[PDB]
Amino acid sequence: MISIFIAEDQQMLLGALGSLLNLEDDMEVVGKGTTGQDAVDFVKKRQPDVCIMDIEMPGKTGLEAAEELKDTGCKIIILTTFARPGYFQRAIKAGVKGYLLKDSPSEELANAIRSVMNGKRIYAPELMEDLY
């Protein structure tokens, strides 16, 4: 069983992703948040296997949260509306294992979580096509 914390400011996606991931037999959403501070606080206290975060959030950003959680054993998957090529390097240095676009199929999300748990790095193909 994979324990997942989800930090997303847009409540409709937060609740919809939480419902989606909970239907998986090997996944459990153990907590939900709306700010980067919520992610830092939960991860440091509860130590989930995976943290799914929006790159942009009020208070502390998903990126600032990722950097603060760099030395925890938690696997960070970043969600972004835009490819944000200029912010991707900061995410790599932060130790982000997954970097996904909100235009990616929802089916690939559970697969990304499982891949990241198997020590693989999952990046949006659009970001390679954008960066190169």
Q: Are 21 and 110 in contact (CB under 8 A)?
A: yes
Which of a copy of itself, K ion, none does residue 111 bind (CB under 5 to 8 Å by kind)?
A: none
Q: Are strands 2-7 and 122-123 parallel, antiparallel or unpaired?
A: unpaired
Which of a copy of itself, K ion, none does residue 107 bind (CB under 5 to 8 Å by kind)?
A: a copy of itself
Nearer to K ion, 28 or 41 (CB): 28
Which of K ion, a copy of itself, none does residue 11 bind (CB under 5 to 8 Å by kind)?
A: a copy of itself
Residue type, 14: L
What angle is formed at CA 70 by the lines to CA 67 and CA 76, rounded to 5 degrees?
A: 85
Name the one residue in this structure whose structure tokens are 């960070």: 76
Among 11, 19, 47, 81, binds K ion (CB under 5 A): 81
User: Binding of a copy of itself at residue 127 (CB under 8 A)?
Assistant: no
Q: Is 75 exposed, middle or buried (0-12, 13-18, 19+ CB in 10 A)?
A: buried
Residue range at the interface with a copy of itself (CB under 8 A); choices 37-45, 59-67, 86-94, 97-105: 97-105
Count of C-beta atoms within a 10 Å radius of residue 81 = 12
User: Binding of a copy of itself at residue 89 (CB under 8 A)?
Assistant: no
Among 2, 7, 17, 122, binds a copy of itself (CB under 8 A): 17
Which of a copy of itself, K ion, none does residue 83 bind (CB under 5 to 8 Å by kind)?
A: none
Closest CA to 30 of 2, 56, 53: 2
Residue range at the interface with K ion (CB under 5 A); choices 30-38, 56-64, 89-97, 119-127: 56-64
